[PDB]
Amino acid sequence: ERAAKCRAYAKALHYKELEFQKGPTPAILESLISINNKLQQPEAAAGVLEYAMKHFGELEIQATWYEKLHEWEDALVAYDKKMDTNKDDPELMLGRMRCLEALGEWGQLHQQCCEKWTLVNDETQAKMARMAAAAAWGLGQWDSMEEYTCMIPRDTHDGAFYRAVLALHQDLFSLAQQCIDKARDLLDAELTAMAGESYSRAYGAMVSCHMLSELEEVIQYKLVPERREIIRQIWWERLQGCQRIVEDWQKILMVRSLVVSPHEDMRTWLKYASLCGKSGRLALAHKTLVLLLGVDPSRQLDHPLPTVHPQVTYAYMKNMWKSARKIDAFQHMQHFVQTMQQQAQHAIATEDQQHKQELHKLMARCFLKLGEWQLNLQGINESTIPKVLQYYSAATEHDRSWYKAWHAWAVMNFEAVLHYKHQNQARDEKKKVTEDLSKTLLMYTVPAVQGFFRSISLSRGNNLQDTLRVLTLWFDYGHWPDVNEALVEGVKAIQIDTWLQVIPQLIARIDTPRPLVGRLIHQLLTDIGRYHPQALIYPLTVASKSTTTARHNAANKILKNMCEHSNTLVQQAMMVSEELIRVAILWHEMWHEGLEEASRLYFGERNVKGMFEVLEPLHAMMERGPQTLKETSFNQAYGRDLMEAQEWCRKYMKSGNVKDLTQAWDLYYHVFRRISKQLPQLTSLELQYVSPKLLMCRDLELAVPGTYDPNQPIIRIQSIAPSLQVITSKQRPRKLTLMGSNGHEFVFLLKGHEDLRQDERVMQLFGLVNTLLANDPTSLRKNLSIQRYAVIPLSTNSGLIGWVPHCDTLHALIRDYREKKKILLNIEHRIMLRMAPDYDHLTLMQKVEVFEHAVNNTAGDDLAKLLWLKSPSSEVWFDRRTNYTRSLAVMSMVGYILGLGDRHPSNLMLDRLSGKILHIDFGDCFEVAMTREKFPEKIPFRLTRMLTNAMEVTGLDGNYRITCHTVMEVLREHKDSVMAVLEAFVYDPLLNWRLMDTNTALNKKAIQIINRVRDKLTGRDFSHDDTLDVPTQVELLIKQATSHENLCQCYIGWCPFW
Template identity: 60%
Template sequence: MKSWAKKCLHYKMKVNGSEMQQWMAELLSILLEMLSDASSPEKRGVALWTLGQLVGSTGHVVKPYTQYPQLLDTLINFLKTEQQPIISDLNAYIIIIIIIIILVTTIIIITVILTPTLIIITTTIYYPRYWLQGARRETIRVLGLLGALDPYKHKMNLGQIDSQVDSTALLSMSDNKTEAEASHDLTTSEMLVNMSSSTLEEYFPAIAIATLMRIIRDQTLAQYHTMVVQAVTFIFKSLGIKCVPYISQVMPSFLNVVRSADVNFREFLFQQLAVLIAIVKQHIRNYLDDIFTLIKEFWTINSPLQSTLILLVEHIAVALGAEFKIYLPQLMPQILKVLMHDTSKDRTVTVKLLLALQKFGNNLDDYLHLVLPPIVRLFDAADCPVPVCRVALETVDHLADTLDFTDLASRIIHPLVRTLDSCPELRATGMETLCALVVQLGRKYQIFIPLVHRVVTKHKINCQRYEVLSCKILTETTIAEEEDYLLMRHRLSRHKNRDLALTSSDTTTIKRLHVSAGNLQRAWTATRRVSKDDWLEWLRRLSIELLKESPSPALRSCWALAQTYSQLPRDLFNAAFVSCWTELSEALQKELIQSLEQALLVPDLPEITQTILNLAEFMEHCDKGPLPLDPQLLGERAMHCRAYAKALHYKEDEFHKGPNSQVFESLISINNKLQQKEAAAGLLEYVMSHQASDLKVQERWYEKLHNWEVALKLYQERLETNLDDIELSLGQMRCLEALGEWGQLHSVANQHWNQLKDDGRQRMSRMAAAAAWGLGQWDSMEQYVNCIPRDTQDGAFYRAVLSVHREQYSTAQQLIDSARDLLDTELTAMAGESYQRAYGAMVSVQMLAELEEVVQYKLVPERRPTIRKMWWDRLQGCQHVVEDWQRIIQVRTLVVTPQEDMYTWLKYASLCRKSGRLMLSHKTLVMLMGMDPTQTPDQALPAHHPQVTFAYTKHMWMAGRREEAYSQLHRFIQTSLQPQTIQLMGQDDEKQQELRRRLLARCYLKLGQWQESLQGINENSIPAVLQYYAAATDHDGTWYKAWHAWAYMNFETVLFYKHQQQQQLATGGEMGSTAAQRAAADLTNPRPGVPSSIYISQFTVPAVDGFFRSIALSHGSSLQDTLRLLTLWFDYGQWPEVIPQLIARIDTPRMLVGQLIHHLLIDIGKHHPQALVYPLTVARKSASSARRSAANKILNSMCEHSPVLVNQAYMVSL
């Protein structure tokens, strides 16, 4: 019965294959148990057949090899043992057919939508024949369905090889991304690569906000935080709703500062937060949980922040509308406390809260029974100020428009009548509120009319609206019939302002401001600049003036802060410059350039030189540049200040314009400085132009080494003098086939075909057929295939390909079966030695299985996604050999073009590149691009397929065109990928956004690697490389490679500056006393180019953070990262050495000194309790009572924040 169940299960899988995925583990376990049961051949046969159907229907390929490591050996063992048909009884076959018909009919009725009729037809006709076939052929078919597993992976699965691999080779492909903007600083350099011609206006606020946020995160710059917040608020106001992309940069830092700020600044921050929420509206929702946590924390009954917090809540309510309702439960305790226990003067806080409640509208529906009674008590209380009572009445009036007061009517009207009776000042407002209640209650108000009438008559209260409404109720006239104009006009007028606030325009254009060219001209004028200080002052004034006159509101908002915080104008210099540059006339631009060139010529001013070099590079990356500075001057100054990457750029530009000995010398020197030995050697070879050696080599040697390009060249050289040599022609054809040069291969075959005899044609036919297939020359292919013997695996396979193309599927299946039978002997023999030897045959087995799937792909469109996924998974499980991949993906071209299967072909091109097959890589990428970029070297790479463009830049790099690859990739990011990514952020296609961000992260990582490769690690290259790696982590926060690269680069930077510092100190020790003092002064006042401990501490923390993240994300061995992390921890994680000296003096007899020491140790204990707990525990056992007392005092203070640590120390010290 189990066997029959398996057979019936097959058709369930064919109909609902994807639905079976959730039971794969259970089914595979059962099938493997049956496959291992040697006592029942039929059970094993049915299990084998079912396994094939399960894998083919669900697309669960390759993975079973990993989940069940013995599966592959079990299947191969079938080839050695099984000889009988799976099912030999014809009657059983007929019974199965009947069962299948019934089952399929039932499934069609139950799952009509999920059951394509074509699947049933092809299944009942196409597959049952396997049940009468031998186990050997079925085994080969199942092996092909599962895929040709890489022998190395097979050994890993079996535990024969340590599965721990180098973690740097692993990728984290998780789709769950985290927002990195809040945890990483965005500097000018990091934002530089994000700029493009289409995003300059977005770039200016982005870089301004990123720089400002870096300031606000630094607690040592707290004195500037108020101006930072003012600048950010101004930027958001100027952007309007366009500020939404920057919320993620601002809010995390903003909210963190709120918690740590003093009272006055905190109130200011809450006020500005309300302003920001009014601008971004509902887009603030991602941060509301944190905002309400802060509100609850600081909204206490006597807090001076109450009014500000209420205003903030009001803005949130208006911004969110109906979404505000879910946050009300968090605020109800504070709201009720204010309404019932407000102690502020004249109850001003209550008034503000009531005004806010009016904006809550129907969000209060579920809490009306809680809120309304305290409001009513306000105007019913004798001791409540009249203004508060009036606002309370108005609040009831407003809420009556949106909330149902029916159940609470008596609790409102009776107090309201008492108010009308006792307070003349509130009668007008009270009657308006009463009218609102009458409109809502309608006829239900009739029972209250006598009560109200007595008070109205008693005090002669005149209210026309109330008289009209009460009269209609008494006459049983519907109020709404005639009330629209007379009564609703008042309510509409009352809500006009609120509606305007809720529906205000969400678009505010960025206004460009006027630029005063005269002020800029006075700033850049370089007359009477003599000393170094004069020039530094010139740069400072120019930087500030550029911000002041910038037409970008975002940059100009930073001007006030730039006057007091000197680092800000330096950080924003490039952005401010490019914003002003376009506003200047041509004459003024020339004058400015002259001033910059004059500054460049000043010796020993690395600060100014670096600034101008960075500016020149920056301007090259946008459509407003490049700057018309002399490239030769820039190159010389870059060499002088050791900016070798920039120097290389400008020297290469000189080389293209006209090479000379000096340029060659400079290029060789620069490449050596950048540790590019191969490039330097290439330049030397280019200069020397020495001839090749006369050593004769065999072309076949290069074929064996898979150096097809060299082999092809040698064959072609020999063919020039031996045109009729068939061996040379066949060798040439083998090279052309391996390189995928189908056109040339087809041409060579046609050239020689008619001249060859049968033996020669037979040797050439397979390669000629492959060329014709690659070109789609089906008639030629038939001609060549006819010369391949039918009783060979190649003959059967190529004939099957032709049959599939002609849609002769029955013939094709017979040929595929013949090919399997022909493979049986080879596969069995090879597998008997080792799976490694059998792998080549396994690839052929997989190709046959995929040729069958090509037929399904053509006949059953519903199966195509599953088949495409299977093809991809199998390719990932294969050995990464170019020839194997080429054969496999060639089969798929029968139904899928390279453009439709671009990701597979990109992986193939990548494999070719990494294997040194650059010609094949180039050919593949050109095919995917639709053009050859080498034909237009001066133009940018086509960007309609970003993944292909990225792959082509990597090919350029591998081909030795490194600077061009770096430049093209840089250009591609700026002009295409980054703008497209930003554009997608405004759309709802999250998957596409995710793909683009991941691609952007990989581009940035590659830029960083290339920058590091081009320049090495030095003072000038470190910032650029780090900014690329940081950008990679920003765009893909869960990618191991990005975090590893970021951490490792910071680690290398620490070592670099540590080495420089050691050299500097050693040099200082050999100086005279004066020179040593000067060197010491330099160490304490670091300049660019001078190493210091400041640099070490600057990069240590990011390195540690990066290693923690990379270790967490690594799926393989993280030993190297762990060792580097420990190195940093041991070298720079030491506790302050001054602590033992402080503890030694805790019992000093000087009272004032002792108090200071105690306070200092208490503060240290809050941040580094581990550093104090042990020496203090020892001190508390001192024989000196004063020392014991002091130690216990400090330990007691530590118990408040680290009780567990102190208790553990007590326990250990017992």
């Protein structure tokens, strides 16, 4: 074999695609949607039709396209247009009907069947029957069913089926019994006849095998009275469980309808109606509810709604709101609630406790909607603010638990706070002012804090947003007593767990000047130290070595406080981090950069005051004396020269000579030449010369950097490998490798001179997006995730980065293929220069040509082609691709929201086993990359030609784009959680330094950026005034990412041709 059959299809698809490559024919296009269908890859094939459309409008009739695109609702009104203009046309009617039997439009499918019965066509007579029997089935009329069934042959699985139904109605159970097994074996043989190249008919066979086993329980229900609960449970469980598109579930219910009328099922049909409105078949969901109410499509439209069945009325109400009629929907809600609280308070004769309870819970949901809709209809202002708070609190009262109700109320209070703040900054743009405002803000701030707390405890494991929110109020409100009280109250109440999510945000405010704020932070941090230290040491250690006093001071206090309690763990972690920092930039390496900088300032800038600031701490750094053999063997070869080179420098400091100063540089240029020679020889570092203390380490209690989480047994640094590979780069990073106490190895990257903190926050954001993605059903269905990695900063300069296994940079894979296939690595580059020696100065017009010309004389395969030559089979090939496409698209949208720039071929990589893509280096975040001076990025994410190519042919139409909406849809819904996180590091006190680089207060700048993000999450990113829906915005983005005009401008290093 079964796994051996798909292998064949995968391999044929490879060649079938490679054929399409050579020339797009409707012939191939056919044997391609089909072969992708066998491979049960639905959406990918859907893309094959998207291309079929936009290039051949040639299986013709825009209704045959709307029909093949399962857009029945479109194909119906397209066929009416196609029929009312045309004539009768036997087939046009067949399709016109097929739309109806999919839409569950039995009313029209039956009429259209009878009302048109000349049907001189005999095939038109044969097909006709199958449809108008099911139509009849849904309409009650069994006589019509039998008439139309007596036309269906007993040869057809369909013909054998409807007999099992007519028998079950007229109570002929052994007739039905046999009919079922005959319809089975007539469908068993039918799944071999179309041995793969069929419709969702092997997927809808599961709809027919479902219905047949259910139709057998419908048999069981008729005589045996003792399965009336058993059968109803499995029916109910295999519903919330099952996920079969609207249409199939109609039929599935129609089987269960022979036995249970909707009024006894209620919950069953509401659940179904619930899904019709979620998938977006409102006019269908309405008809479900109209039935259940047993009252009008409220044709008496000016009349009050029937409170007969409270649960159904509520459904109707929200269907009405999701429908057009939404001031009308709002109105029915106020009155429904008023009717409900009377139906409670008066009608509850005590021995009615369960009805009282479920009744109060429905009301909370009503109040939440009333608040919801009020804000939608009126926005946020001085009239609505109290009204919705009123509605939300009412909900808070009627459910007491329920995350959502306390959430809503918190956010409203918090948005009430924002409303007045942002109104008062409006005032101050043009003494009793501040007072009433202080009364205002304080009035809304305290409830907000309170609400966010009670909401956080009800989320537990899913509260990043609300938790961060607490912090904004906490940090942001230089603490007026009342607010602080609520905070200390919550901190008492809420679990310590919570705060781990948020550790870096807290630590970013250790040195808080606001005295009441800091107090609590320290106490909280210490308590977080008490249960789960580890979760604290690394980050606290970073802090305790900080230029800013108050930081490192207050950081130590918390460490001291942890020694009463975990001392050696504090001590181990203390030292390990110290040592790692020594190992990261070695004594001479620091000198080499310090000498380059010193000569730039003197010989090229006449700056000896900057120069002295560059050299003096390098001299003071060694003044402590060697501490490792590497620090001594350095001290021999260079130290004496340097100590005496400083001698001349300080002879000048006092003499103000220039012959004193030139003697110093005479020595400095000696050691520089010496080191520089030895530098490309640093290809390895041995622990016994470089840091002996780290070699010494055996079986520590310190956890392997960034492996710690509760739930999971703690892994400790059992040993460190004695040799570190030095990746010979500009920042010569180390490839440190550790041994785990579980047994397994852990590899890291010890980076020298990059503040690793930003990357860390991004990984944090990713963590979230990953939860959100695992929780949206569609995304979880497709496995949508960002591959992330560990980031453990060690200071402002250094840190550790988790090594991802099986990875090579995009650049790496190409460089290989290119040299293997004897292609000059930088050929597009050399082509471009040969054409235009002045490329970077050309006009856009001129540039585009050169670029196009380079592309037209080079292969677009490479990536696609090396990924085929990599694969051990063809299904392995195929899946790695499905992974790839998806993973890339995920990060394409997320990267857009993050504004992730600088996506050159050594900043993204590919896992060679999964085929999934992975991003590194999150320096240029937010529009930064595009805002820059020299060589600005015009791109939203890299969607370059070889990446496009490596996808399926029909790429962007297929999997990519679909995955794009799905992901972007999730992001728009969860826009707030996402914005909490981003906001949380735009205004991060120690990270604001990334936007002041627009030079080569911030209050106003940070505001822009965060608006920029909100725009992107509310379809306002493009034109200021349109609110673009996901598929448009996505379309717009792919457009932007692919424009030759945008790509030809990219700095050549970014390789717009890869």
